[PDB]
Amino acid sequence: APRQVLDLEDLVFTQGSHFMANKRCQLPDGSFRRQRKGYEEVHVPALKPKPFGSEEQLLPVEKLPKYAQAGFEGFKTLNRIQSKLYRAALETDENLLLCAPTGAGKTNVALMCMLREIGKHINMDGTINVDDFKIIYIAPMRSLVQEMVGSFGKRLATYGITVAELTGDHQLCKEEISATQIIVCTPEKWDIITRKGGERTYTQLVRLIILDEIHLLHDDRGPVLEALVARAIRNIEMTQEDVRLIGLSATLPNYEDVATFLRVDPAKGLFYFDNSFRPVPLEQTYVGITEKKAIKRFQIMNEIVYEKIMEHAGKNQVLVFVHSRKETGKTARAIRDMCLEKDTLGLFLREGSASTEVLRTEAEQCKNLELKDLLPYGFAIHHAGMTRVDRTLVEDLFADKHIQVLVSTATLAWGVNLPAHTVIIKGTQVYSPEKGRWTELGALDILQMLGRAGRPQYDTKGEGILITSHGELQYYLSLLNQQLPIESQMVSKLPDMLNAEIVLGNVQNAKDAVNWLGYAYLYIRMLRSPTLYGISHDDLKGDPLLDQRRLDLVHTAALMLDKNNLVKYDKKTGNFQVTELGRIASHYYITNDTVQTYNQLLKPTLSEIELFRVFSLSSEFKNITVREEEKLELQKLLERVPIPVKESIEEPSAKINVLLQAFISQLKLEGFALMADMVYVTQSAGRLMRAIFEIVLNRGWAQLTDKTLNLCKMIDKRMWQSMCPLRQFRKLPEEVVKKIEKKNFPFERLYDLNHNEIGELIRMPKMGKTIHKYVHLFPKLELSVHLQPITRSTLKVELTITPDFQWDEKVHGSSEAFWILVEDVDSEVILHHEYFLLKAKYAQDEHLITFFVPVFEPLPPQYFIRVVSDRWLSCETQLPVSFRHLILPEKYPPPTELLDLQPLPVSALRNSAFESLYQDKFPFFNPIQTQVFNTVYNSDDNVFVGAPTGSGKTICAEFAILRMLLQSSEGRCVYITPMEALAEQVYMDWYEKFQDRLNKKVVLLTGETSTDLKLLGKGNIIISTPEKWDILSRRWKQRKNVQNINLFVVDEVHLIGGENGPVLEVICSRMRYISSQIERPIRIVALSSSLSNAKDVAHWLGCSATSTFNFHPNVRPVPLELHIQGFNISHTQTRLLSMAKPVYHAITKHSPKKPVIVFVPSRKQTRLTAIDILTTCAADIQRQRFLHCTEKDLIPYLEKLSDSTLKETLLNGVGYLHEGLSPMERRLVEQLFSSGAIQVVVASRSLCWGMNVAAHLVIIMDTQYYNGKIHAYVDYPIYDVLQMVGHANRPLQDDEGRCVIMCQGSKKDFFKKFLYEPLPVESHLDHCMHDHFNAEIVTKTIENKQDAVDYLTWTFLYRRMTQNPNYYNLQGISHRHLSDHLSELVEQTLSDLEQSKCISIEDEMDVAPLNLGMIAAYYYINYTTIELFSMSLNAKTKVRGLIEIISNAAEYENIPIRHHEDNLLRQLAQKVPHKLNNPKFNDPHVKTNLLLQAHLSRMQLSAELQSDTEEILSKAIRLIQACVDVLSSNGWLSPALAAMELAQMVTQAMWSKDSYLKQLPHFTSEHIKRCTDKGVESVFDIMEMEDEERNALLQLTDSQIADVARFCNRYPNIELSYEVVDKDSIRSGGPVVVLVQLEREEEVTGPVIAPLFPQKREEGWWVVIGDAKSNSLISIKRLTLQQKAKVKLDFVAPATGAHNYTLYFMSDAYMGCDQEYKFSVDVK
Amino acid sequence: GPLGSMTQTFSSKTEWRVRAISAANLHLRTNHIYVSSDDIKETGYTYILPKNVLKKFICISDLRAQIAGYLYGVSPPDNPQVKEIRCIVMVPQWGTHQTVHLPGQLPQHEYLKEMEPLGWIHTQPNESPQLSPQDVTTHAKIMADNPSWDGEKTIIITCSFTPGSCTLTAYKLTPSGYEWGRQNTDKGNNPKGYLPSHYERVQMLLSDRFLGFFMVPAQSSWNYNFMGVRHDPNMKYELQLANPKEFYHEVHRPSHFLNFALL
């Protein structure tokens, strides 16, 4: 509590890596100092290698583990370091710290650690599961990154490993992260990547992090390493996945603290090698100049270097290091022009040397100017501003010992392996734009440069010469002689680093933050050297763990963050609240002062002038000053800037403004300082201006959004808007585009023209074609719109994007990104926006985008839809969206008034049997049940009841069923509900009410056809989902049990408007049509949530206005108190974070004692939120409790579980429910919840339909979820939200229900509109017509096009077309308008079906079913699927082909695909009997091919792959039967028999080659071996055995022989007989009737036994007449067999003579029962 | 006598820069817009101007160089004495502090065909008791070339830059004003024959009840004050349904950018 606010600036080491903590410096033996005029020299002799140690020998590569030898291909043995290190590196997972001098071999130690990680993932086929793992190699300098990518790639190629740099911004380029196993990058790049976090990230796979040159800890960049390590190690804790860390360090003090910071065990993973292990001993020279005056000091420098250069001419190459691309040539010239002046140039190249000619030749062939000037003299330069091949030649010449003096910069030291015998660091001052001044070279650079002294093979010693200021001698002496301690620079960065952890949710309060700080290198250093870090030794003993000090640091930082609006900080609780501005600061790597400035100054009205000024005030620039010597050159620019600058040249912000504008305009400046400053400013501008763009975009600020996205693009492309977009094609000649610009005419005018007029208008014909191509390479999109009014104030927009340009990877890469911006009448507010990605693979297709926007009355004149490129300048299309002709739906009617009636007693049913179903549960029905009772129970009118979920509509339908049971003895009711989980719940309740308690038959349709067909005959209450009733009711003309229905009830009928609505609408329309045909009316009851357009549903279903009860949400019996909380954060993970505490606060405010359901977007989120709720409960002083049992009571329930976490959370009173829990787990959680034991349950969204628990308070935590197939977030359908809100309803327990919806702020108004008011629903049948039209042509209900129009008139679609024409793309409601609309619909649907050869059309009017269409309709198979089947199946496709064809059906296309299993399936395709053709593992069809083979091989897979196999299995049988029908009607005997066998194979889950006994319960392979070698090949052998020998061969328990007995007692034991009717008078071409009699030995005692198949099946059979020699199927009939049945097969006679046919009796459910009989017929 | 003692160097200070800085502050005036109370109080028609397009019109303007927009609108259903301004059309133009230069061609677009032309709106640096004679002449010459401009129904709305604000006044010509203006060739501030009986005030009202919209050129922008040579009284132009760019937007002054780029 008694905190203290610190001054962090006072604790900072201002000199960064130049901070020298050691007071003294001990020089090695033999060092000596020498005096000169104006400078001093310190000489340090080369060290001598250590005597070989205790038991040291250079490990030969042959003793390495064999899998690792390949990574050391081409080496004899490891060196001394690697030999000391290989056991720890290759044989343990121990975190390591290796300290060694530069060049000692640290990176090969790192390769050994890499190889150990790789060895963890060796497949049995010898390859590498390059998808199981990632490895991060953090290197400090980009040039080093690139070199490492190269060398590691080549060392690991033989393993099939991909090594890659992280290239550019990854808002579109993250894909290659999936293909890279070894990411090489800088600390900052890994920091920014792991700051964004999110899900679908690859950072979870990281198993090894190599931290190279970790003494960067001592640098100003060092805190990035601390952030990385703290974040990784702490992430280990909260996820239990290990990550190995490897640090590689220079040899410097505090390495043991570095080891503590990396969790290195000092006795296992710490290895320190002093400078005597340098590959080449180094002789060192330090030259410290004392002269203070600049000019004399400059000449002293040049003299010192020349004198040192002369000590080496003709004997030793010299590498000189300067700190400028420009100083390199200048000093090379100084030295060379000095040498010739003293006539010593001949000392570098001996006369007639072989190398003199090489230098002459390659100089004359080369094109670099200073390089040509220098090369003949033996000199050269090397830096980044030079060509790649220039540098490659400089390196080649130096390597072959041809160059004698090479002047170069730091980048050569990092990026090339180019050692020189002698190295001269000429001065140690460098210009730092960030610091705004000259400073000393960083430690890493100095070490690296001098590490280049001494070539490994060719030198016995190296010679490092360092020239600096005399006052720096102690510093450099210390750095290079193991005495510059590594300290922490992190106090300066603490606020930014803390904000990054807060944004991630890793740190949620000051206690979290103290814990996090305990992982920092700063903390170890504070513990060990407190006074260095501003802590007295007595404070340390008052605070031995620095708990108090850490809290003060965290407090200080959090206050700074709170003042700048990044965080909301509660000083009392210590809680941190994330904000969108804080997130933007973290994710864009912006310091916190800068986003405070942006937040303060950004306004929607901002001009471009002010935007440039705001940028120039960023705190990244705070050290920039306007130097006197610059003020002239800046004035001349400031006089002419195209963006006016308000402030004077005295202000640094004006200079930064002018440098930005000069950069965009590609101006060269003269000041060396000014150019470097411009580089710094503009390197930052990219991510700064993208941060501004995200701020203003998400605030909805249209004009400023446009200005700032443009400025981002102008910075990136280095040109202004007013230039010709053609400049962006770099290949074009700049002087041509300047011509085109000087011709003032619009760029768009070039679109109409062609080569001729193009080449003419620009007065240049030679380019007419060239330019013509580029203008069509330029990204361009065409836009069109379908406006779909939802209400009078909400509009659905369908936007079609049509690409209108030529794709070229050379210009467009693999994707092209755009912003879709919907703006208001004034172009002032962005009403809607979203990112749009045009992938190369779709560069020619139209894309559909749908969204909602508000409208108001009187309608505004128009909105605008802009589609703008994220990267191309002058690349946008804007579509005005005019409302002049928008037809709004009429305002909805007022609801049915809720009558104040006396509550109806149960005794009103006047029937004691009926009254016994309720009288215990309640004494009275609710007001709605009371008001509808008379119409439902006392009349036969069709009824509509519309009311909110939780109003007891189900009981109303029950009234109708009870009336049915009174007026009709064996009356039949069919009940439809749209969701399978609802059907199961209603079946459990109604079986109890109407069977257990009224002795009627209640049945639940299964999805297996004949099962359901007999259930329909038995039951008086048939419960079904829609598609299961669709397939049955299609056949109503042939099925009496469908038309003789008394009562048809449809529940949740408002889901006609949802995704699967068309089948619901079709079967309801069919029930009406059948009712009108049979003229014995089927009564219809429709139940629904409150509908604004209820009268339309009721009229469609023939409900009298007095019989339609259209209630609105206000009438819910248990009042609903609904709160909608908006959340401003646009990034989903961060927004979920901001909701975490509000969830807890909502519980304590709205339901502190009563049960709470929390709905969350995903399985993963359920446990995360359960744990978070518990954490917050523990730290709530008010003390709430959610466990209302004692621990003893929960213990037995606890044990019935396998999930550890669910056990812990349940013990503390919080359950969770998701799809991955076994059914027993879910039911136990629900038991505890409903019994009051646990007060909270956290359920995933996908479960909102099948929950059997209710609650006092429901919280909906966010309202979108990730769909991985499309890689995008999707909004919860309103239907699901209504279902979720409906769980807040306990009629017998509460006086109200409460619900809190937490959602993105932009969704809030939508939810107010569609939750406080009743719901408008529409049809989507017009989008789902083909399959139903095809069924109605099969059934002869549709026989011509007029029939099809008439059919449409029975639908809800037809009704809605007159009420909301625009929604269906009608522009009038005139009778001709919709007659034409319906005719168009009919023509399109019939023409597609005829194209697919499902129907035939005669005279363009009459339609008839073809065989394909009959098959599609009968089996409920998509017509596209059947068409493909028709193409693919052929006269010799077999089991392999059948599985392939069936997998490729459209019914499976939506089978989940997650690349998290790629290799899995890849390796599944090897353990698979049939090898697939050209396997692409990114396709759900081949995925299901593999899952099918898995099932047939009985391979146990994961739980998700198991449920997905169950889904595949629910459709496989229908698809296989369709294949059988196609094959047989084509005449192909062998493939049809095969497909029948496949039916058997998927039912019994085995192959043809497998053993029939493999069908028996409790058998394994060993039982089959014992059976095969003891006289048992088939099932029938087993019953023909005495008990003893059976049990002896069997080796099984007793309850298990009961199972084998059951299987044998139901295994089909048919025996067949056949007769050829009138076998004598057989004549060619005549009829041939074959009679087959089948008799089963016993009665069918139940369904097929097939425990590995999910649906219960009944036995199916085919009888087949074929000639096997011809491969000719001649006759086929299907049948189900009770006890005995006769079957007649009819076929045409052959040409004449004796013919031998074969009769087949084939099962579809069991292997091993197929019978076959040859017979002969003599055609005389 | 500084022949060789004191010598200074001229440093260019171009005027459009100060004007562009001041143009960035125009939004502040859109909160303080005043309409004058008519001295006539009765001239048949009351014009209702929607505030959204008025505020945009102010924001895209300049404090020295006049800009102008053409007015289109209709009468409310059963109220022919009221004219609601529904559209402001921006056409290629340039101006000075005293007048605006517009093409001879009047807006032609299908989307306007159900509206009637109601005259024009233009900004002015300073308020004034009387309608400018430049304005009388401009309006009379449009009328004389375009019979769709009814003298009894077309108005000039002046939008004057009063300190911290904008003040709007609406005028129409009289028949004598039309006759004098159509023959006036004197562009100065006091041409012979000009009289205050050449115009009269009309009732004007600002409204938040409905929204207006803009049309702008299809192939250019509307501002030619930096590209004067390319503007010609005879130039032809089409229109599109879109909102106009502000006065100092980049595409209105390309040569500033290119000439800096050559420096």
Ligand SMILES: O=S(=O)(NO)c1ccccc1
């Ligand atoms: O089906 S929807 O188009 N999606 O949520 C809908 C939205 C609001 C109201 C009714 C239907």
